[PDB]
RNA sequence: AAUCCCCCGUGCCCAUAGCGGCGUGGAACCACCCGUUCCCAUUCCGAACACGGAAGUGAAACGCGCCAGCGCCGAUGGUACUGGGCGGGCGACCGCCUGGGAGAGUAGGUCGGUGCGGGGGAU
RNA sequence: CGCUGACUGGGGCCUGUAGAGCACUGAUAGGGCUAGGGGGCCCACCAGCCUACCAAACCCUGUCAAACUCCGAAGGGUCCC
RNA sequence: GUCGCCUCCUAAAAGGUAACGGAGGCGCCCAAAGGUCCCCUCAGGCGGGACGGAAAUCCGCCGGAGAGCGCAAGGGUAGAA
């Protein structure tokens, strides 16, 4: 069946987030799927005690879109190594990750018979 | 009622005249001179309804 | 029609409420006396519960 | 002119919950099952409960009333054979 | 060895010289028989640690004996036992003991000792195929060492109805190490 | 069986203060032990102690194991006098349910530890039962 | 959770919403490939294959019309039985333009809703 | 059109249907699929919701089967507790007589069982 | 008013102490696996190393609960016959 | 000391009972926790990457809901409040 396991995209994010207005507007222009999420906590490791603020930025981008980005954005990054994490997936840079997509990935999405994703398929 | 100048203040609301009023408890807390809603005075039925008093 | 013939013993003096009724029920006036009935789980029951109450005899 | 501490001592007051009409009696358009007032009655008997099965009340009229979760709101109708043609 | 009974009489039975004890077997049971005197002797040997059987009407001379029971009561004198045989080649549920010797390591030199939350070994070798007395003791003992499942060391019949790393038997300070 | 006000309002959630369980040494067969028959909110302290003195007289190999442990407690004089009695705690233990598996003198041939425990019973309080286990004591 | 509280997506209970009363569970089961609805009415009721994409083949008019008819007819088939006013059954998804379609059916179908 | 095999909508029994390990199905079915002007639509993209349509595929969700490892179910004989009756001990309590008799604990049992309708599949 | 009443036989439907039980919770002991603090060693920004003292949490051997209970009777209730 | 009222336990299992018996809350509030119509799937743990080395923010798996609900408890209960 070698026509299975053999890959076919699957998500792939790329974001950022600072204890804050607009900076994500530089985010909008580079793509088109704005991320609006609220980080938090309550300490002074940066002055981020505020436990309920809007600073988390995350511009989701799988398939289609991500393609234009994987593309016009894959040249300025210089590495290709280690940064290779188990769960077929990896994260480099000012904040970006992308996940593998072996054939036994999805199922892990079902509300039912949620096969805890076997470790021989992924 | 127990008149307590504590964000606890009782008020009503006319019926554009529909004539009289109808019961209501309140709290400056927010929106001060704010208070509107419809009902129906002995006057036909319905009618805008400010609450201020 | 198993006809039952019981007698009176150990005065229910001060003994359980109901228990007594089962007394006046089955039909129990004066002491150490003898009465008879049909098996009838009903009547039966009562009496039995009354158990120690006195003595049952299968007669007719 | 106040009150003290370190005397926990704090009796509690009264309630009055029940199953009134229990299961399978002369049904009367009135307080069905009770253990949560403001209740929102239902249709006939109830069988849904943090237990499993269900309960019939061979008694049928307008409706009864719930208790908020406990028992198990009615809906599984059950007028009772005593609801046919006179 | 012998033991009889099986009607329907536990109280008196459960009394005197005869203690209850069901005739348990895969598929069928039969009123409790036995006796409060046999249990003794035999049991005394090593209930579910070896195995035999008794001749009641020559009926079915088979093994398996006890897979449950209890001297329960306070007094500490059993009453109401369970009995199940096995004329099959499936014998699993096999719990037979395992003994050391005294190999000198932490003891006869370090005084130290060792707990053996194990002792027994419910496994399942070659059905109707087990050495009533199996011994295994690679030795070792003292300091903060410990041995359990995992390592072990199983001979022939490759079962292990059990798991790895778990209550084997270590060496602790009978005083201090 | 009067017991306490709750496991976290009156007095519930402690260590009870004592001297842990195990002592002596292993032993696969030899069943050497002790249990009782008496009912009594086993006198903590008295307890803790006792058992201990047990080790005090032996030392090493003989399952100085012991399956007890209090965990609730009484109360009395504190405040006015005798009437409306609030409560001042003190002395937890555990019900020795009319006999049962006490502590174990468990080991091959080491009666030098049986006598011990023995010394252990002597002590204690509620009489005690001197005994053996599956097999006896070797 | 209870079977219907660990999976996800459905709303069946938003079906039981109409269950209470109003008339037949004019329930409309969809599966793109086509649309299929029954008529679960109270009392261990049942149904009467009122309208299906296959019943009368699956045509070649896609969504639009399909419904437009499947419904109507459906509605036709039933009001022959002896129904009248039947309650709608969004079976699933939001009264999508399909849905809405079929819907029409009923309505136009003269089976009030 | 008033019989079985199959798939599809789907209901009751609130795990003897769940977990997961391997597998099988696409003529038919169903989904995934192919695209996105207009219906509607994502706080971000027509991923999900969504309109139109072949090729491609059974990978995936999914349906039937096999597997007891995790679970779930669970007897008989059995011991506690006890309604009722009466005795021992100053004692905390012990016992007897008569009907009730669980959980856990080994056997073993389970990989659903069963409604109605729709598509076919069996002149 | 007149067989409706205490009581018994039958039939449903309920409560869920005693007991028991550990997956909810809070104890708590013997221990294994482990990282938090150690602790001794390259002198120790080393964040590399071994291991006998304290631990958190998961795993085995165990155990207490009136304001715990996946479990569950004695019995009492209530409508009908 | 304390008297009202809300919950637990006590009540022995229908309901309900003292104790100056146990412990803990209330004399608020929310104009939007209001009414419906439309959508959502928790805590947490694990694995991978910005500012981040407790403790986020996103991405991919596991989940009788153990999170969730202005306030004390207790019932509830995501299908969901």
UniProtKB/Swiss-Prot annotation, chain C:
Gene Ontology terms describing biological process: translation
Keywords: Ribonucleoprotein, Ribosomal protein
Endoplasmic reticulum found in the keyword field: no
Ribonucleoprotein keyword on record: yes
Family label: Belongs to the universal ribosomal protein uL30 family.
NCBIfam families the record matches: rpmD_bact (TIGR01308)
Listed name of the protein: Large ribosomal subunit protein uL30
Organism: Thermus thermophilus
């Amino acid at each position: 069946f070698h026509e299975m396991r053999e890959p076919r995209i699957e998500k792939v994010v790329v974001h950022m987030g600072i204890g804050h207005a607009n900076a994500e507007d530089i985010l909008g222009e580079i793509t088109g799927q704005m991320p609006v999420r609220t980080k938090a906590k309550r300490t002074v490791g940066e002055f981020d005690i505020r436990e309920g603020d809007p600073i988390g930025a995350k511009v989701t981008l799988r398939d289609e879109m991500a393609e234009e980005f994987l593309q016009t954005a894959l040249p300025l990054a210089e590495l290709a190594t280690s940064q290779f994490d188990d769960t077929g997936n990896f994260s480099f840079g000012l904040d970006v990750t992308v996940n593998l997509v072996r054939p036994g990935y999805r199922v892990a999405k079902r509300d039912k018979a949620s096969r805890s994703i076997p470790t021989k398929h992924r | 009622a127990k008149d307590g100048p504590r964000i606890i203040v009782k008020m009503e609301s006319s019926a554009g005249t529909g004539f009289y009023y109808t019961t209501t408890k309140n709290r400056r807390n927010t929106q001060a001179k704010l208070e509107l809603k419809k009902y129906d005075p002995v006057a036909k039925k319905h009618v805008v309804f400010r609450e201020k008093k | 029609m198993p006809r039952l013939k019981v007698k009176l013993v150990k005065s229910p003096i001060g003994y359980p409420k109901d228990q007594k009724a089962a007394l006046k029920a089955l039909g129990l006036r004066r002491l150490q006396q003898e009465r008879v009935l049909e098996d009838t789980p009903a009547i039966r029951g009562n009496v039995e519960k009354v158990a120690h109450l006195v003595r049952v005899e299968v007669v007719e | 002119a106040h009150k003290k501490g370190v005397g926990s001592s704090k009796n509690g007051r009264d309630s009055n919950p029940k199953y009134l009409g229990v299961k399978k009696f002369g049904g009367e358009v009135v307080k069905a099952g009770n253990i949560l007032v403001r209740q929102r009655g239902t249709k006939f008997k109830a069988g849904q409960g943090v237990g499993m099965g269900r309960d019939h009340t061979l008694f049928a009229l307008s409706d009864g009333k719930v208790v908020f979760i406990n028992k198990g709101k009615g809906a599984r109708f059950i007028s009772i054979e005593a609801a046919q043609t006179e | 060895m012998e033991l009889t009974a099986k009607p329907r009489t536990p109280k008196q039975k459960l009394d005197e010289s005869m203690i209850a004890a069901v005739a348990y077997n895969k598929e069928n049971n039969v009123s409790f028989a036995l006796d409060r005197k046999a249990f003794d002797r035999a049991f005394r040997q090593q209930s579910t640690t070896g195995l035999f059987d008794i001749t009641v009407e020559g009926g079915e001379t088979f093994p398996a004996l006890v897979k449950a029971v209890q001297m329960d009561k306070r007094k500490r004198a059993p009453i109401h036992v369970d009995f199940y045989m096995v004329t099959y080649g499936e014998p699993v549920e096999v719990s037979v003991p395992v003994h050391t010797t005294g190999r000198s390591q932490g003891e006869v030199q370090g005084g130290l000792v060792d707990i053996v939350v194990h002792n027994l070994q419910i496994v399942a070798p070659g059905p109707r195929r087990i050495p009533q007395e199996l011994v295994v003791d690679v030795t070792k003992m003292n300091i903060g060492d410990h041995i359990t499942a995992g390592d072990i060391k199983l001979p022939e019949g490759c079962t292990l109805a059990a798991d790895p790393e778990l209550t084997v038997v270590s060496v602790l300070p009978p005083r201090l190490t | 069986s009067i017991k306490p006000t709750r496991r976290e309002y009156i007095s519930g959630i402690p260590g009870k203060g004592i001297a842990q369980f195990k002592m002596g040494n292993n032993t696969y067969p030899a069943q050497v032990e002790n249990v009782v028959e008496k009912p009594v909110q086993i006198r903590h302290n008295a307890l803790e102690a006792a058992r201990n003195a047990a080790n005090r007289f032996v030392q090493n190999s003989g399952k100085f194991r012991i399956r007890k442990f209090p965990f609730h407690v009484i109360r009395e004089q504190d405040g006015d006098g005798m009437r409306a009695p609030f409560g001042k705690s003190v002395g937890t233990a555990a019900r020795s349910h009319g006999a049962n598996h006490d502590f174990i003198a468990w080991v091959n041939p080491d009666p030098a530890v049986e006598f011990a425990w023995r010394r252990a019973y002597m002590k204690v309080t509620p009489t005690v039962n001197i005994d053996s286990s599956p097999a006896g004591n070797a | 959770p209870m079977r219907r509280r660990r999976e996800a997506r459905t709303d069946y209970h938003q079906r039981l919403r109409l269950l209470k009363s109003g008339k037949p569970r004019l329930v409309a089961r969809k599966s793109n490939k086509h649309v299929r609805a029954q008529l679960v009415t109270p009392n261990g009721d049942d149904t009467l294959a009122s309208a299906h994409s296959s019943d009368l083949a699956e045509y070649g008019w896609e969504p639009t019309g399909s419904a437009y008819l499947t419904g109507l007819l459906a509605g036709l088939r039933a009001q022959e039985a002896g129904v009248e006013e039947a309650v709608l059954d969004i079976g699933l998804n939001s009264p999508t333009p399909k849905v809405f379609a079929i819907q029409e059916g009923a309505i136009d179908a003269g089976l009030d809703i």
